[PDB]
Every structure is written in structure tokens, then in C-alpha cells.
Amino acid sequence: GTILIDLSPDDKEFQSVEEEMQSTVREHRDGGHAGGIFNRYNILKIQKVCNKKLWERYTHRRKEVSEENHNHANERMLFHGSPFVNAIIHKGFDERHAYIGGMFGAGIYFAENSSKSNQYVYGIGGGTGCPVHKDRSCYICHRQLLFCRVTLGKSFLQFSMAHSPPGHHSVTGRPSVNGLALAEYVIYRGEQAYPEYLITYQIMRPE
Ligand SMILES: Nc1cccc2c1CC=NC2=O
Numbered sequence: 785g786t787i788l789i790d791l792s793p794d795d796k797e798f799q800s801v802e803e804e805m806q807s808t809v810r811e812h813r814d815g816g817h818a819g820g821i822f823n824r825y826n827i828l829k830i831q832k833v834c835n836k837k838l839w840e841r842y843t844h845r846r847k848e849v850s851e852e853n854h855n856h857a858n859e860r861m862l863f864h865g866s867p868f869v870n871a872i873i874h875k876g877f878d879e880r881h882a883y884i885g886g887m888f889g890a891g892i893y894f895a896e897n898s899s900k901s902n903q904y905v906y907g908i909g910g911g912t913g914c915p916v917h918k919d920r921s922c923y924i925c926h927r928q929l930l931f932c933r934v935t936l937g938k939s940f941l942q943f944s945m946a947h948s949p950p951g952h953h954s955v956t957g958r959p960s961v962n963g964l965a966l967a968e969y970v971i972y973r974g975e976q977a978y979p980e981y982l983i984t985y986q987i988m989r990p991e
């Protein structure tokens with residue numbers, strides 16, 4: 785049931801999605817080991833992901849969360865990187881997209897920094913890098929991220945599939961050492977995210 789609509793680079797929506805991609809690149813403590821060395825991306829395509837069943841699954845859970853949290857879904861747009869982008873856009877998020885070994889337990893992880901999600905496109909820790917050249921810093925091969933609508937509801941704040949902490953709908957990983965890092969977020973039900981944009985890109989070699 786999924787269809788992908790290409791956005792024009794002239795479309796304000798393409799432009800606002802690209803700006804969130806580009807403006808949330810940071811340097812990483814691994815010096816580029818997992819995700820490569822880059823300060824910016826070459827955006828090749830941005831597609832809107834349209835699936836009625838999946839959307840209605842999302843908005844149903846969103847209303848449940850909202851009614852449990854004084855009519856506040858606490859909805860964010862966040863990045864997700866994974867080698868299973870194609871399963872996600874067609875069948876939705878579920879337990880098979882959980883990061884079992886993540887620092888907040890087995891849940892589905894999202895990032896405010898696009899460059900954080902970029903580290904997971906080829907696997908945990910970047911895996912063995914691109915399938916073609918086995919390079920985690922490949923500047924040639926096309927990568928994909930999701931920019932997703934995520935319902936956080938009442939989020940458990942951690943300074944730093946399973947269930948959410950009692951009385952909470954998600955976990956927030958607040959950075960407490962690296963002053964430049966943005967937050968990461970974990971949900972424990974696939975229905976609390978909808979994969980709204982598929983972004984196809986390359987990382988760009990710094991000059
Ligand atoms: N662990 C973590 C933190 C933030 C974002 C992501 C992840 C994992 C996979 N994909 C992600 O996009």
C-alpha cells in the first residue's frame with residue numbers, strides 16, 4: 785500500500801526537510817569511524833511516504849497517547865537510520881527494527897542529529913560500510929535516511945521489544961558530556977512513529 789512521491793527541489797517542503805538534514809550534522813566522538821568523515825550532504829532525492837493503513841495506525845496510537853497526557857502527543861520530527869529502510873516504508877516500524885543492544889534497552893531509536901542516524905544506515909556502528917566498497921566513509925554510494933513523525937508523549941528523561949518505563953511513553957537520552965550533541969529518543973511501540981520522508985543522499989568529502 786505504500787507509494788513514494790518525489791518532491792521537487794523547488795518545493796518548500798523539500799527545502800525545509802533538506803535544511804533539517806544539513807543543519808543537524810555534528811562531529812562525532814568516533815572521529816567518523818561509524819558514519820564517515822563529512823560536514824554536509826549531497827541530497828539526491830526526497831520522497832514523501834504515503835500509506836493509509838500505516839498513517840491510520842500512527843494517528844490511532846497518537847490519540848491514545850494524547851488522551852493519557854493532557855491532550856499532548858508531544859510529537860517530534862526525528863531521523864532514523866537503518867539498513868531496513870525498505871521494510872520500514874512498506875510495513876511500518878515493528879519489533880524487528882528494535883535496537884536490542886541500545887543504551888536504553890530494546891526499542892526503536894531516533895535522533896535529532898541527522899549525522900547520528902547516518903552512523904546506523906549500514907548497520908550498528910556502521911557495520912562493514914557500503915555493500916559495494918565495504919567503506920563506512922563511502923563518498924560514492926547512495927544512502928537513505930528516514931525523517932519520521934514520532935509521538936513521544938510523556939518521556940522518561942535519562943541523563944547520559946522492551947517496555948517503556950512505567951507511566952511513560954518513550955525515553956529521552958539527554959546528552960550530559962558532549963555539549964554539542966542533540967538528544968536521542970526511544971519508543972517501544974512501532975505505531976508511535978510514521979516514516980514520513982525518505983531522503984536519499986551522499987556524505988560529502990570535506991575540502
Ligand atoms: N542508537 C541510535 C540513536 C539515535 C538514532 C539511531 C540509533 C540507532 C539506529 N538508528 C538511529 O537513527
Ligand SMILES: [Zn+2]
Binds near residue numbers: 915919922
Ligand atoms: Zn561505496
